[PDB]
Amino acid sequence: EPVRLAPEREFIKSLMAIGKRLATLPTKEQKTQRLISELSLLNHKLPARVWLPTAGFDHHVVRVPHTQAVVLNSKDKAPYLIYVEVLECENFDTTSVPARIPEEPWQEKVRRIREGSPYGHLPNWRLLSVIVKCGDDLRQELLAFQVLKQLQSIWEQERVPLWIKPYKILVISADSGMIEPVVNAVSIHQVKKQSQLSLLDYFLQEHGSYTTEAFLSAQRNFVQSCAGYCLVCYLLQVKDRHNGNILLDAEGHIIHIDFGFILSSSPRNLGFETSAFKLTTEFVDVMGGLDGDMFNYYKMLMLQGLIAARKHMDKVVQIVEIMQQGSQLPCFHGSSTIRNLKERFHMSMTEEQLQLLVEQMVDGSMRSITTKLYDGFQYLTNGIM
Ligand SMILES: [Mg+2]
Questions:
Q1: What are the residue boundaries of the PI3K/PI4K catalytic domain, all occurrences included (predicted)?
Q2: Looking at the domain that runs over 139-166+182-379, which CATH code has it been given?
Q3: Domain map (residue ranges) of the chain
Q4: What is the CA(364)–ligand 1 centre distance, in A?
């Protein structure tokens, strides 16, 4: 029997249809209750010869634990997060559909679902997640995803140990799609709110003291991820960066999410910023302060990462142009979007000039640091300090 597409279509469309019925309800509480009923229905039809395209490995969907889903706000087109149980197979075109079996860290959720699930005992059992957004255009997020993948490939090609975490995007319709969330990480906001610690203090408690391998490793990951996302934010002009859309994983990396405002997305800021990526006192303290080795490493990585990116600029630029041809999104605004993008690769600069540029940009990213208001007055008065 050949792989049929109608089952998959109807599966994807059922997840979308569920959102339309959620949209009829005013409050999260009510949407949540509705969602539980909806997912129960879904399981009548499972297991089936259907898949989550975001898995990136062959598998069949066996179960959607109806109690574990989450509505994410009270908006008219409110997204919802589902957990989806699958059984991995090697060969999908030749594997038959699994037989049915009768009836807050990620790690905890994986544990509780596995124990409640009739399939949880299977060695090929895997839990995936998706956020279904049945009334949002994700083509900009998809563009970002594509650019991030390309930069990752570039940095690997050029042996630059920058670290980012692209997260998978599916564009369904013009104003609908799905996202695989980054699961093994919590927002900085929440890390701070719960622990009531500074990031430095959190690392010292969570990983270890200054002389521990664990601290040094976490610090390295933080620096490598900060540098990666600094270049991402600059090249793509990602806006709206706050502690709610920066996550921290258990290894010490940061992960930026929600690339809503990118490139020429309105509104433009009026504060002469090079980037919306800002390097706070808290961040710098993690890196051992302004004259730390790890801060110097951060600036070296930014230089090498930018050297690498411009060496392969066309690969990045093509992705953007293809998207711009294919559709007219908010992030585009005629020829200038591409022009401005190309200029941010600084093709005309020598490496000495790039290094001076990186010092300037890094200094720029720290403008909001309180010390900077204190010790900047030589630029605003005839005093030399
Ligand atoms: Mg002066």
A1: 104-370
A2: 1.10.1070.11
A3: 5-133, 139-166+182-379
A4: 18
